Amino acid sequence: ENLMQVYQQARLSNPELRKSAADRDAAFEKINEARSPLLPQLGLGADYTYSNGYRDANGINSNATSASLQLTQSIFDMSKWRALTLQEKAAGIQDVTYQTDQQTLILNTATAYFNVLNAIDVLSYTQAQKEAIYRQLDQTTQRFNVGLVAITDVQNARAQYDTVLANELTARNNLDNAVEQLRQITGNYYPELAALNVENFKTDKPQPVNALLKEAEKRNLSLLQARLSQDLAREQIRQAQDGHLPTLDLTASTGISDTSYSGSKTRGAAGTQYDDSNMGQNKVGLSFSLPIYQGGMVNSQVKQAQYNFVGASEQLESAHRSVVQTVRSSFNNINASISSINAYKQAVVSAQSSLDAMEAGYSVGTRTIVDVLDATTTLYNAKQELANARYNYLINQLNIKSALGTLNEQDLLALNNALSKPVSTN
Amino acid sequence: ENLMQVYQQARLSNPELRKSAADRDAAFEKINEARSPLLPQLGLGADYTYSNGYRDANGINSNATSASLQLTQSIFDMSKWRALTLQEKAAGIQDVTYQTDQQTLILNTATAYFNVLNAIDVLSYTQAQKEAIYRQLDQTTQRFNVGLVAITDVQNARAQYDTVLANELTARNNLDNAVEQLRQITGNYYPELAALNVENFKTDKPQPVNALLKEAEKRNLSLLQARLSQDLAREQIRQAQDGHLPTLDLTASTGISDTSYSGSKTRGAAGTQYDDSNMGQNKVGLSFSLPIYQGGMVNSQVKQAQYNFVGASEQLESAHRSVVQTVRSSFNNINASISSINAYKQAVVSAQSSLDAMEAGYSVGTRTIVDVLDATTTLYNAKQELANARYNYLINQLNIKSALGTLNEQDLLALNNALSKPVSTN
Amino acid sequence: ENLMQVYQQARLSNPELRKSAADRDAAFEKINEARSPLLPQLGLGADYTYSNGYRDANGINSNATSASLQLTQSIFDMSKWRALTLQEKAAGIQDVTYQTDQQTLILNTATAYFNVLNAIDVLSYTQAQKEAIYRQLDQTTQRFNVGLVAITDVQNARAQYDTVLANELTARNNLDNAVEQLRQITGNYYPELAALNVENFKTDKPQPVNALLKEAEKRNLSLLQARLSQDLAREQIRQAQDGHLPTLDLTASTGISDTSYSGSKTRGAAGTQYDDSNMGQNKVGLSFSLPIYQGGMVNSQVKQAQYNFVGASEQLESAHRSVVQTVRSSFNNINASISSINAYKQAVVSAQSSLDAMEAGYSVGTRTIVDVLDATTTLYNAKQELANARYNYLINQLNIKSALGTLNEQDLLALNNALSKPVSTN
Known part of the structure; x- marks a missing residue:
């Protein structure tokens, strides 16, 4: 209910945050396959194949049968190490942008939170306006009834009343609109939210700009991501350089063989060479x-x-x-x-x-209660338009901290100090 | 001319709709090549090659003349089937987004159609405003001429007149702009369009929200596309699983080769082995x-x-x-x-x-005709600002119908029922 | 300082322009590798490998020792030429878009400048408004001091004063904002900028629109880029047609071999065939x-x-x-x-x-001086809102010239003629 708790339930309700986290998971996991190629490549193959050598050596008939394991292991090629480093830096990138999105969640959360308040404000005010204009119309109406004034004025106040009705409905409508805006980053409706403790407002002075500029130089997420992009480009450079590298390699494999000769041509002076074989081999070596x-x-x-x-x-x-x-x-x-x-x-x-x-x-x-309510109208409007100004002060208070690239739950807790009375939403 | 007919010509005038259609055509056609790999791969690669050995076995010249066809056909590899299913689901995707775009064309069409109607209105009434203010300038002018009110007022009315002139020109200007906006989707300039039958407005009550919820949940294009995306992700998963598949194959190839021999080394004890080759071959088998x-x-x-x-x-x-x-x-x-x-x-x-x-x-x-036209001013302004509101009712109609993922020509036909009298555009 | 000089220093300050430039450099340079495949492929791949037979093959150890240079050269494959033409057209593309951004830098560069001027304007005039309202507060105040009026008016004037103060601060604030906006394109602060020479302001009539259309057909960058895209699609078509091409090629390579025998089975009846052989070869031929x-x-x-x-x-x-x-x-x-x-x-x-x-x-x-300064308020506001209008005239000039796909430094020089007096920024 409090802004802090609102952050809490919403901490999991966000998909895009979780989405980005999972994406980071994809990056870090991808580092594994990035490490993969250096590891030895165990393998297996097998084949059978009849053959018939027509023409010249025509009439021979030869099935063929073989199978083999094939381990392979490259040794010298830094390019893969290079790509590994690329994967690393990309991972760091994904990390940073993820944190960025976290801060984004913070901001949106606080904003949507305040909007509901503001809507409540405008709601009530428009309501009071409604009643005021209403008895205005009633007065004017009765005034026509005794015949003091032209019908045109009656229709005027009529128009005022209908207009302010529209103003009610659109506002009340905006209420639930904002409510759903809140549910958008929650998945849950809320009956009520805490009112601002205006009596204890913080008129804090800003820090001098230069130090803030320094901290900004130190820790914006975005520019940091840019620098990572730069270093990555350097990695691309050396990767382009990698083409000049000699490619040391090492094959290692063994293979059974059968192949049973057949056909009339094999008959007569086979000379062992035409005889069926059972040979096997264990080739291993450099490439x-x-x-x-x-x-x-x-x-x-x-x-x-x-x-x-x-x-x-x-x-x-x-x-x-x-x-x-x-x-x-x-x-x-x-x-x-x-x-x-x-x-x-x-x-x-x-x-x-x-x-x-x-x-x-x-x-x-000396007057009418209506007029009193007119002044009352101006009164309320001024009231939480001023409150609106306070919330804007808060938003700016975050943006500067957001500008730093810092931000944390704790600032939001400091915000949570500002809340006070319970207030029904609708 | 009528909104229905405008949609009719619009149906072909749109490039992006046709673009998306052709894109669907691509998505479908690509399914064919997705089916392709399973088909047998016939081929040929005949070539000639001289050879000249040296060192130890130096001086034995030769030249091979290879020529052979190579049909091939793998049997067991589900991964291709997987990709086929991917391509299928992608085709479904393209389909959905295409339908979406159709609805989009509808919406934009009706929108632009209405904007003209609005601009005409603003134009006319603004003109009346022009005449009114003008004759005020004349009255005030003459009033100076007889020696009454100070010149400052004269210049004031002057400013009024000039200002409203600027309002005319910008009004007309917006008009032709909107006309062009219409041509942009139509490719056609239209002198006139039907006026709304304001006398017969439809004050339909909205359906209870929950039913609309169930319906739109049942049939929104976007979320449907999301589900297709998810299923596609699952397909990607099994495709990742496909790497464990053993790869059954079947080679089938044949052809001849003639390696003629030459050089002095061939001389002396050729032993038939050093005679020129004339062999062919018919290899076939599993891999x-x-x-x-x-x-x-x-x-x-x-x-x-x-x-x-x-x-x-x-x-x-x-x-x-x-x-x-x-x-x-x-x-x-x-x-x-x-x-x-x-x-x-x-x-x-x-x-x-x-x-x-x-x-x-x-x-x-008691007054002046200008004053009458001031009342006239507020009058018609109010009138077709109200018309504007009716168009907003229409837009909202199409929007609620849109979020359903529904929409069709028919609601627009009802809109065509809403239309009435012909009205020249400019 | 003058708009021309500002453009000059800015002309190198832009990253994105230089970015696009370097990108063009990439598109051009890539044409080289596009030309590359046609060139001969010199190569080498020496290696060494032990072997040990078993089962029928048992007991005959050996170790092959191979080395060979490998030139290769394809002769017939138009698809490479095709892709070359693709790359060419892509170079044209990157060129055109680079021109686009070249205009883009200009437009903004004028824009922010005029914005600075405008900010200065509103600033000063807001200041005058401040003083006026201030003396109203003083008057009303003193008036309460002798008690002519209700306190409510006093608070009213109070509110006016605080309000206009807020307007001052936001005005100054906007000033520095625009300054920084200018620095964004320039990377430089500027103490002062030339005032407009309003006395000689141009009011040229636009050329008739149809001639402007025929001019438009000439060389908008965008449409030209589109046509290039089309031609590129055609190139893609012939490239698809290129799959029917027979692939004439030419092999050419040479290499040595050693391969030393070992093992007891090699002993006895070696028959020359079971002997070490330092062979070499010079294979060359068609592919x-x-x-x-x-x-x-x-x-x-x-x-x-x-x-x-x-x-x-x-x-x-x-x-x-x-x-x-x-x-x-x-x-x-x-x-x-x-x-x-x-x-x-x-x-x-x-x-x-x-x-x-x-x-x-x-x-x-007859009046207070304050009132006179109220007229002064309306005065200056009108003044450089009119100035604002003149700048809008300029911006439109650049817009229409931009639509042509034209634009040049010279138009900006014509703009530079318009400038006059030096004016401090803050």
Whole structure:
């Protein structure tokens, strides 16, 4: 129910987070097959085959029968080690992006949480507006009944009333909308959520921008991923270099053989050579090769890896400019939130005193209760529009921390301190 | 001209629909080559080759003249069947997404069709606004001429007139833009389109939400595609399992070769063995093999397929909760459309009576005709903003029908029933 | 500083432009390896291997020792030439898109610049608004001090003041934002930028739209790229046709051999055949093959390439509809800009005369100076909202020129003519 608990149940409800985790699992597991080729290749084959050599040596008839194990083991080829390193760095990549997605979950969660509150706010306010305009219409109606005014005004207040009805329904509708938005990252409905403890609000001042810039230089996930991409490009480079490598290898195998000769040609002077055999063999030995020159195969690849490299570096710098922009913008947004909160506070005070004034106006009955509710309307609107400003302060409070690439459950707990009273959702 | 006919010509004018159709054609045709490998592989590779030995067995010249056909046919390998099933499911995928795109074309079609209707409205009424403000400029002008109100007001009205002119030009401009928007899907410019039969609106109540839930769950295209994706992942799993398959084979080949001999070394005791060859051959037989352990080849792939599976499943549930969200939101939007239509109707009646009232004001001339056209302004603005609301009702109709995964020409035919009088576009 | 210089320093600062450049370098360089296969394949693969017979073959140990260079050279396979042509066309593609981004850098570069100007504008004027409202607060305050009015008004003016303060901070904030936006393209902060020379502002009429269309047919980069895609699809088609090609080839290689015998079975009646032999060889000759029939390999591929072709064609027409839409829309936007500029000009004149009027009002003291500054507020707001309109005129100019697929530094120079006075940024 509390934002913390909301994070808790939602910690498993997210598929994409779990999806990404599983993807990381795919990467780390893929490292295994990345290690695989270096290991020896035990194998087996078998065959049977009749043959008939027509023409010249025509009339011979020869079935053939054989089977063999074939162990093989390459030794010298660093390219596989290279690919292994690629797999490693890619794994680190997947790790980082996974953490990123975690932070994303945090953000979305908090956002969706606040939206419900805001919807409740607008709901109630639009309601009070409804009643106010309603008795406005009733008054005006009665005023026509005694004939003081033109019918046109009656229809006017009519239109006001219908309009505000639409305003009710759309808002109430937005309520459940946001509710389902919450279920989207939960899979569960919630009857109620804790109200903000506005009385104990934190008007915390921002840290100086430069240190934040430093921490940003140190620990944004994205730029880190860029650097990993760069190093990976370097790995691609040496992998392109790998083509020049001599390929030391070692075969090892044994094989049975049968083959029973037949046909009239075998008859007469078989000379043992035409006789059926039972031979078997245990071949084992080195294998090796070297490309020397291959039409410029391993040449263009080099430059390709190079362009890939420098381009990746460009992406890195782009990320750099990006994080600078983002963090500054966030900081600034926080300040904006501050000032806005100030303004709306004062507005609250204003509408309040105005309200009390008009209430006194009804105290000796100078006005109508309707008007009192008009001031009441302005009052509430100002109220949780100010609350809205506070939540915006919170969101910015996360974004800057998000900008750092840091974030944790603990910040959300600090948020959880802010919550207070239970509040029914619908 | 009518929305139905517009859809009719639209059915061929769309490239992307036809594109997707042809893509389905590709997906189906590819199933054929998916069936292909099982078929026998006939072949030929005759060639000639000189040879000149040296060192130890130096000086014995020769030249082979090989020529042989090679039919081949493996029998046991389920992995290919697996890939066939994959291709099948892929074809189902392409099918589903194709139908989806059809619905998409429908939606966009009706949308663009309505936008024109709206722009016409805004155009006309804006024009009336132009005339009204104009004659205000004239009145105020003359009022300066007789020496009354200060020049500043004159320039004010001037600004009004110029501003509203700009509004005209941008209005007309948007009109032709929308016309082109229509041509974009149609490839045709249309001088005129049918007006809505506003007199006979359909105030249908929405069905209870749960039934719609059950239906859409039963037949949404997207989630269906997800399920196909999951099944495909399972197929990938058995395909990973396929690496344990022994590979039964059957070679079948034949042909002749003539290696003529030459060189001085052949001279002396040729022993028939050094005579020129003239042999042919008819080899045929099985070629079995089983991989045994191979460094963990067919291992990591298993878990990879597994993670692929579960992640796909997570996507499935994701899309599930998603469509729940969407359909509820749609229902809600429809209700909003209802209430809005109500409100604007009443606003229409109101502004109308206000109009008639002021007209009566001019009946003894208390006002100016411009004022009457101000009431007229608010009037028609209200009118076809209400029309706009009705179109929104239509769009929501198609949307709720869309989330079902249903949709067809028929609802659009009912929309065609909604249409009435011809109206020139520009 | 001037827009031209800004473009100049920026012209190298862009990563993505340089990125695309290097990518073009890749596309070109890859043509080399595309040419590569036709070249001769020199090679080598020496190796050594022990052998030990058993069962009938038992007791005759040996160890083969082989070494051989291996040149190879294919003669006839058009598919390689085909793929070469593919690579060529791909190079053309990367070229074109590179040109696209070359325009893209320009557009944004103007955009942010004008945004900076605008931000400066709104900033200053908001400041003036601040001072005005401030003195209203002071007036109302003092008025309460002598007690002419209710406290509620005091709080009202209070609220106005805090609000406008918030507007200041967000304004300044937006200023620095835009500054950083500029740095994003440049990597450099800028103290100052040239003011527009509004006095000599251009108002050229657009060329008639049809001529612009014929011009459009010439060289939009996008559509050209589409046509290249089509031709590429055709190349894919002939490449599918290339599976019918007989594969004429030429083997050419030489190698030595040693192979030493061992074992007691070799002893006795060796018959020369059971003796060590240091043979060498110089094999050379033709190679050839032809598929005949392969289970429908090169069949489904044909239809596949065909579908690829037609789909590409559909994309081409899609691009056609696209460019028509965009160019007309641009033209229209220009017209809108014109009329808007007209309107705001007149508004400026109006507010000006109103200002002078009220100034005269203070000349004999009929009003507060604050009010005069209110007119001042409306004044400047109108002023550089009009400026904003002029920049929109410029942006539209660049847009329509962009739709042409044209654009150059020279148009930006023509823009550079428009600039005038130096202006500090913050």
